[PDB]
Amino acid sequence: NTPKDQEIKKLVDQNFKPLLEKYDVPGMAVGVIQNNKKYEMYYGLQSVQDKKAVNSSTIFELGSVSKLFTATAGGYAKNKGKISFDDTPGKYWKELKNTPIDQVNLLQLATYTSGNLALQFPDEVKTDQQVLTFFKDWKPKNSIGEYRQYSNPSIGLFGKVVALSMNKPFDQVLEKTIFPALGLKHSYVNVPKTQMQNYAFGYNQENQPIRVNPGPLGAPAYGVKSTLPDMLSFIHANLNPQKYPADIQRAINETHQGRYQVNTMYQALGWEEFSYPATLQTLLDSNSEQIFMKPNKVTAISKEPSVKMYHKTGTTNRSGTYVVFIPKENIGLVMLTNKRIPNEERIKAAYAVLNAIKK
């Protein structure tokens, strides 16, 4: 183990490992990628009932971090000419033609500015048929494009349209096109039976194992599962897109462009973006209740910040996910767990590790 191996292990042991006992989390995988070198730390149990330890093959649910793959698929479709972000959803989902939702464009769906879509579908919307009925009956409220409200229905519709534009179901868009283009070999929307023994159980607040299939249009919002080595490769592709072939390189760069600004945060496709260096308070504020749950007025970007960093939290439940990268520093970090941990704690631990790593 190199001098870097030891230093990084120590930093991760100092800042992430205590979270396991503090929040009774069965298992965790934490990785750092720096200058094309991976550093992987595994702790605890993949499955409590099986006494299977977390390892490099463990597959974790990504939760909301799944949206980063929806974003990449959309950047891919757009740069192949299959969609334009100025298109509306009825161009592709023909039953939405001549309905009010066909007045919202795809970029506005992908970046949560339709003006009338909340965090979740209404409780009564449970089947694919009911989702279509929901969108046909939809009416706008706030001026389209002017207010951000984080929303699983919003990006789910975006992902459904992306799949329609590529003439494949969304699961196939990821498993047959996007994941292979990124070199990921153990990332899934549907975990195959030959991998079930590697699939971590999620654990609720009562520490019981929980597994559920997605709701309607759920896969683009929270439906991806992946390993720590695969997620480090994904961060590498975001740090060095120029090393990848053009179609996926263009897709990745598309997810890095700021689309509008809310206070100190810039919304890109999937990724949240910040001027580097971002103070700890700026990163914490991006996960305030105000930003997460309320409608916030957006402002057009004058010019993008000159030096940037990017992160995404994978809230949900039965899992904790956090990913962050800094192009200037050629470094990034991934945290995966099989139990929820307060976002505040994920951000603080990653901030301390990244601020201490020697160049």
Author numbering: 3 to 361
From the article:
However, successive serial passages in media with increasing concentrations of ertapenem yielded the ADC-1TM mutant containing the Val292Phe, Ser318Thr, and Phe322Ser substitutions (SANC residue numbering). The Ω-loop in monomer A of both enzymes adopts a β-hairpin-like conformation; however, the B8–B9 loop shows a large variation in conformation. In ADC-1, this loop bends outward from the active site, whereas in ADC-1TM, it folds markedly more inward. In monomer B of both structures, the B8–B9 loops adopt a similar conformation (different from that in monomer A) but are ~1.4 Å apart. This difference in location is a result of the Phe322Ser substitution in ADC-1TM, where the smaller serine side chain leads to rearrangement of the main chain of Arg321, whose side chain now projects in the opposite direction and forms hydrogen bonds with Asn204 and Gln207 of the Ω-loop. Since soaking experiments with ADC-1TM and ertapenem did not capture an acyl–enzyme complex, molecular docking was carried out to generate models of the complexes. In the monomer A docked poses, the core of ertapenem is substantially shifted relative to its position in the crystal structure, with the pyrroline ring rotated by ~60° and translated ~4 Å away from strand B8. This movement of ertapenem is a result of the difference in conformation of the B8–B9 loop in ADC-1TM, which places the side chain of Thr318 (one of the three mutations) into a position formerly occupied by the C3 carboxylate in ADC-1. X-ray crystallography, molecular docking, and molecular dynamics simulations revealed that the amino acid substitutions in ADC-1TM produce significant changes in the enzyme active site architecture and binding mode of the carbapenem ertapenem. These changes allow for better positioning of a deacylating water for nucleophilic attack, thus explaining the significantly improved rate of ertapenem deacylation by ADC-1TM.
ADC-68 is a representative of a group of intrinsic chromosomally encoded class C Acinetobacter-derived cephalosporinases (ADCs), with more than 350 variants currently reported. These enzymes can produce resistance to penicillins, narrow- and expanded-spectrum cephalosporins, and monobactams. ADC-68 differs from ADC-1, which is not a carbapenemase, by seven amino acid substitutions and is still the only class C enzyme reported to confer resistance to carbapenems by itself. In this study, we selected a triple mutant of the intrinsic class C Acinetobacter-derived cephalosporinase ADC-1 (ADC-1TM) that confers high-level resistance to the carbapenems meropenem, ertapenem, and doripenem.
